[PDB]
Amino acid sequence: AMHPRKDWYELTRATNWTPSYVTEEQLFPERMSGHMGIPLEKWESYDEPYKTSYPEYVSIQREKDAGAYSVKAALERAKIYENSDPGWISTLKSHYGAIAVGEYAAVTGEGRMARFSKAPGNRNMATFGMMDELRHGQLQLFFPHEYCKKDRQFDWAWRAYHSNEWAAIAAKHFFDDIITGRDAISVAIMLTFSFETGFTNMQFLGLAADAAEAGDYTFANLISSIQTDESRHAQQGGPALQLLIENGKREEAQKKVDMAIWRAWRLFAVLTGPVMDYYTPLEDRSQSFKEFMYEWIIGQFERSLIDLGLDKPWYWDLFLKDIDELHHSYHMGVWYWRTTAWWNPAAGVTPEERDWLEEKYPGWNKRWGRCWDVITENVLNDRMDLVSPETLPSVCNMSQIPLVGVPGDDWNIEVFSLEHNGRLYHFGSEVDRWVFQQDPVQYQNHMNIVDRFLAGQIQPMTLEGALKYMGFQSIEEMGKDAHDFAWADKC
Amino acid sequence: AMHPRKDWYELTRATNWTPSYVTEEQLFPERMSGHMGIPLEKWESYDEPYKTSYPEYVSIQREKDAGAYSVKAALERAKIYENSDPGWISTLKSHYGAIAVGEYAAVTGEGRMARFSKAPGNRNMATFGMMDELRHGQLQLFFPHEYCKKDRQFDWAWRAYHSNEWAAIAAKHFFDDIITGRDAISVAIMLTFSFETGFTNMQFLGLAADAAEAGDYTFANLISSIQTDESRHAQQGGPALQLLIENGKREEAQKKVDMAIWRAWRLFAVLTGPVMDYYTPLEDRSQSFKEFMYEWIIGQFERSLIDLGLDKPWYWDLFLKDIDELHHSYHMGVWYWRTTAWWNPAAGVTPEERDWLEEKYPGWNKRWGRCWDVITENVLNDRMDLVSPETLPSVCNMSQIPLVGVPGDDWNIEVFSLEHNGRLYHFGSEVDRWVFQQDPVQYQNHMNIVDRFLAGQIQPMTLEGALKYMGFQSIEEMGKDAHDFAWADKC
Amino acid sequence: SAFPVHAAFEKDFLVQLVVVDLNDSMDQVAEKVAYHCVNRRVAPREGVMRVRKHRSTELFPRDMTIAESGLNPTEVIDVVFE
Amino acid sequence: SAFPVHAAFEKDFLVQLVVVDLNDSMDQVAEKVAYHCVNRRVAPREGVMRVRKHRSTELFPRDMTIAESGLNPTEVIDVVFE
């Protein structure tokens, strides 16, 4: 007979002990552990709500992979690469480039907890977490690898995080801040709670919905399978949050969540935003970016944060306004500077798309529409020189993304600047400036790509020079309009 | 360490012994065994060329099913049922009705060998064969079951073999003749060699090619997985054939193959012929029915039959002529009498299709096209009474399929009849009459559906009476034109 | 009285069961078969329809009845044009 | 000599790096920013382009040079119309 897990589970996490040959602080140094002075004994009350055990994990994960790979195999001849809209193909290129090696980096966030968390249950669940992120990194390299032979941009599934390309710097600056660059408890709160119950549902499930509409079941099935792991290991965050609150650290916990959510938001708005409202073909847009945000971030995540005892962030209303406006400008920036991307941005401004944008964001045409009007007229006149840039955008010193605002009929743009230790920094929001001020030692001597350009690190100081510095190896790899401007024919 | 199969395989089939408490003939009665008086010791040289062992079987078959089911699960929302051409849906309905419970009957063919073959290797391979056919019957019930709630015709995946519907009688008269109704050696030669290396490749791989073109990967993936089992268990046939030849029974072996191939051909022409050349949308026709015949039956199967030391069938030239002609008329019969089918036949005669038919079968328009001209004119003129029958087709006493010929400009039709023991029988070819004459005890007291109608077994003796006799339980279940005659608009 | 035959009509694609009467002339039999064929799958044409035993060279006289013909129930006939 | 600024042009969607000269007048500075905005993402219009520190209420005189203005390199300016 076999004995049920409930009867022996406690023994698997009865692993704390009182050190005698080194000190507790030597074994769990604050800079790596992040215990905030909460004594060893208090951490033993940590109770992961989504448990598993080694024999079950290997069996269940064997099954999950068998399904993901069989589906890929059975659909290799569905002609997705050949028959898909180029906007959908660019969505795949963006996703795999932005995600695969970042998932692998997440193994280190989990390893940080597995070694340095004082909570025994956290150390075990983080061991499964290390394994889960290994899975995610490997899947999201194996899957796009077949497309290397079709298109050099898919090399970036592997190459991006090794480059200084501007979007890869943005991704790395965020993930190095919340995943690999902080103590174990910060990882539990910023990564597993904030990012992983907060935003990854958007990129993995919201995008899966659009993928299924687009008829790409290999991809939809993959990313939704990945998120089933997340749903388990993300549950390391809540009990850590609850433990900090019970031990007098609510304010610290709140600040970490406020920071992580905002940082996630800005990157999400530049990567997932344009995918959902512009690259995905109109007929495949299951919901708008804003609608998904309201389902996943407002309706689900923010409600769960309140249930666990935290408050709505101090920047709530700013966040809501950003959801209406930011990604429209981020898309415009990515598109106008498309040659610096490793995917081919779709403009997404045919009349029928502009009508959808107007319904989903009333006032769109009198704002972003005004810029797209100028762009469209230049395409129709074959003045293509006027739709490629001859300077660099100014870039946020926190998010690493261009400084933007609302264009057109009620123009409004604001940079939030800061003098600090003899240097002038510029931030794309009040919250980004605040994140800097929360932990200047984390950020102060970092130089963004424009800082580097001005410092003489990028030679020559031209478009070509920037493109070489960003790691492009051939003409094909540089982003172009997804449809070769064929959308202008509908205008 | 483990010891490789080659070193212990012989012991797995060292199972013949000399009976002492009953006679060899009591243990292996000729009526069930079919050993043709070849002594037990001779059968020990039987050497199955495609071997497996129990531990490998369970492991590999576990893997095969995991893939088949995962693929089905991942594509449930691909909108196959909702978006497919209704001709494709009808192909699914015809396939599952004609195949699922027949696969389950094949378990009994395999069982007959597992118990009654004098060759030990045959008895073991047939045990895996029993298992494979169980798999195939279960997969082909499970897969269509989700469509029960969509369409009562999918009930026939289960119901067909329990009915007296005319095509079900044709299927059972064939399968009961070659699978369940003869001795073990006859099964080995007629089922595993003749039918299963000769025709099943057409219905499970030829059709899979069309399914892939149509974008129905759940189905293509399923049936190609099924045929992987066939490729193994079908290899029981060749070594039985080789043994009969070595022991002076080449003449009887040849006769069994010649019979089984013709019987399979006629059923295949009424079921697969119309699917490949009429129901499958033109754009998804990977090859014509004839082209697939020349690939699988002529180029592959017949060449294999010669390699093994048998001769081309005596009716070779009749067979080649039949491939050009027979399924066009069988199609016409199934469509005109569509109300008697459990699927909705597609007419398949829009001008674009008739151009394809002419290219694939030169002279088609001056033959079958003449009938379709009259039918088409009646549909265009709303004379629908003339596109539904008011009598029964005459039916073959062997194949159970209507007696047909070539219509139009060079009309030729021939029935081959026979008086025998006080009854007049009618056959659709010289070969069908020959088959009857090879074994009259198997066939002589069988009554085809028209014989039953004339004898008073079908009451009332009307179209409705016959339809109710055939097992239809509601108005929805009876076949209709697949497109509700929408095709005439293109004419 | 009722007399079943199997009939193949000229230019059609099949043989059908047609019930005629023992006292039908061949002209009447031809018309009963034509009902199930002409304007359904076979174009109408000028000419006189005749009846013969299946694949036979000889034709039955037009006014000859099923009874006089020697035909047995369920035998096959053709209906062709002269 | 080279003098980088970050400039936001009226009705555009972003701030861009624009390198001007230490001794450029505000009129010259406005035209250097306009190069990267007008007829690219911003419709041309009549009127006088003026330069101001980002979101300031006061405009720099048209003939004032970058050197005279007190601006520091990499400070943010707006270019707006009278």
Place this chain on the structure above:
Amino acid sequence: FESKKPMRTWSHLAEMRKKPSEYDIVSRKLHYSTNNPDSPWELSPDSPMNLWYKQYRNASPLKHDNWDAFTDPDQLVYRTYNLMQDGQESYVQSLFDQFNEREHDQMVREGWEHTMARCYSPLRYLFHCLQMSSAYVQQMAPASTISNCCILQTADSLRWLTHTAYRTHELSLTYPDAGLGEHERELWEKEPGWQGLRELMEKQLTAFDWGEAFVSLNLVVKPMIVESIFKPLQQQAWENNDTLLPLLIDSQLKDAERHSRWSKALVKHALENPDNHAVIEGWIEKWRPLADRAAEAYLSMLSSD
């Protein structure tokens, strides 16, 4: 004709109180050969196989008007059977590997290789007889749910045969002078200890009535093998420091208990018809003596040395 809506499941299951399971959907009411008493198969009603089925299935004294309602208590389908057996068989294969690494066969008590060669390796004949016999019950049983249990039982018999072949060969590597893998047919044919078993199986294999086949095989022969062969072999292995055999036999006994479970459920179904008690009891008493003699002769041989 009436107009009817689509059903949630097959028409024959549509009146179920509970949602049909995978087992119900894929297993139930599949023998169309029971539909027409006069023509089981769609051939001449007096074709040879039609005469065979009319005599040996339809005319069985074991009678029930709804055999199709029989349910495997384990509700196994092909898919779940392979999941279960890949698990059990992976486990057995791993035992073989590890016990081999540890040189298990060298440490058995002196002479055990001869007891194995005499009493164990020729079990391949006995197990193959069970395989052939199970296949016979499969092809004759009057319900697909019954036949399915027999298919899986046929496969299990082959599993046991294969274990035995594998271990016969393996043991012969350590003990090459005991006739292992060489003399099994002669033992099965000539050795007194095997002759009761051989007579039992040759006669059982010629009981062609489906009911008598089922009763003799599953209610008489197979339980005798559990109690008189499998268990005594475990006891002897223990006395002779063979620690692998008891573990292997325990895995085989799981299959055997499963066979007994479905058989018992079939008996319970049959006994709904009170007339069947005497029929079954009659067959049991007919075959019991042969089974008891087979066991006696085997045990007398096993307890030699």
Place this chain on the structure above:
Amino acid sequence: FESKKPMRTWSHLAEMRKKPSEYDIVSRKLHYSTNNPDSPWELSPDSPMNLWYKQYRNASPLKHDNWDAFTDPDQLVYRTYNLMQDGQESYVQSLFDQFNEREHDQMVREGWEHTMARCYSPLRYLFHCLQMSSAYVQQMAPASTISNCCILQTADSLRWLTHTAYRTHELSLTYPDAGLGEHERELWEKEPGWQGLRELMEKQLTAFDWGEAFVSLNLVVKPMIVESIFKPLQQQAWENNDTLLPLLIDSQLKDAERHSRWSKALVKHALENPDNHAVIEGWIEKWRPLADRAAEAYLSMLSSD
């Protein structure tokens, strides 16, 4: 810039002489944190974690120009690790089930439960230390191929922990008066026989240089555990009629040998730089005495009553 054709595989693998494997594609050159010596992570170059990596990874005395070229000799990826371990773990769980059915624990020699409570159950602490330590080498190693071996080793360490938790609980059902599941922390903290191991692990867990961490964990501590804990337990289990523990440990030893296999491969890769011989040897000499003392104290405790 020039126009180039698509590559068959990733740009960094395109010069391979043969077709990249699944392992090559999903495992190689994934730590971007080794690209910029001044800024491992994309933050302020003197952020705390950048300072941590610059000291404890980049500045290690163990040096190689191309750590990325390291290859797991087993070429394991997540998918194949789970296939392998689901096989090995399903086997162990089947052993637990069957030995429990047979009431194995009741038949061990008198007093064995006390030896288990003292020398076996507190192994959960030692195994968890290996788990924590393996995760540290993962996060610090300068190549993803090295880190991947460490991730799988972290999981194996948890596997061993889980075996021990399960069996401690199971034993306690038969022997409820031995402190099983109750007194392990006390034993780990206070019993002399555990103090050498605990000192060794507390100190090893504070060796933050990646190279020293790797050498001490995989070349000193883990091989000691094989020779001084695993094998002696198997011998003692044999003397005490515990037949399950030796089989369980053989499964764990398969994992332990796998860890030694990749470790030796990493050593061989490191020794391409002649300077590394003295570095590795020095760490071995440094850590050996603690390891020896750990082993000696453990064995004295295992040998007593």
Place this chain on the structure above:
Amino acid sequence: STLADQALHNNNVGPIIRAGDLVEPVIETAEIDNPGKEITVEDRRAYVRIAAEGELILTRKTLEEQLGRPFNMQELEINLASFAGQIQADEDQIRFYFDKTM
């Protein structure tokens, strides 16, 4: 804003099941095991959002019956892509729930 306020002030709890063979059995189980709760379902094709007010229970026994094959509660992880509410899981059931009422 009122739209954001309204979205936040919900008490919806329950599983988000990814496309596959668990979607319909989970919906049916939610209905059966929470009588007197309305179950809401939002179908996004790649996933389905299944919810009730305050508390939603899925029992292993009911789920096995609706799925139609042997099923252990832990297996739900293969198809549980996300969930709303806090989770209390055990071998007999999973309960999704909130502590607070908004």
Place this chain on the structure above:
Amino acid sequence: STLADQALHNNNVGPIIRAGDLVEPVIETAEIDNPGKEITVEDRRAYVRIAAEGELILTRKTLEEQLGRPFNMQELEINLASFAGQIQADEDQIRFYFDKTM
């Protein structure tokens, strides 16, 4: 007929591989393991017909190398939907072949 005799008179042997992860590796393996045979490939989307004249060998070792993961010869059954020629199989390779020459 002429077309039919021409179709019958072939000596093509080799595997028919169903759509999936074994198609490209098997084609590559056929080319590598039969040097100086021309390998023909007919792509029917759901399956690919791979052939050579008279004999075609697939070795386990080459197939493992082209597949890029551990591979036992018996696993080919998962994807071998049919084949032309007689089959001679063992743990090291499969040979498809004809006895006669047409």
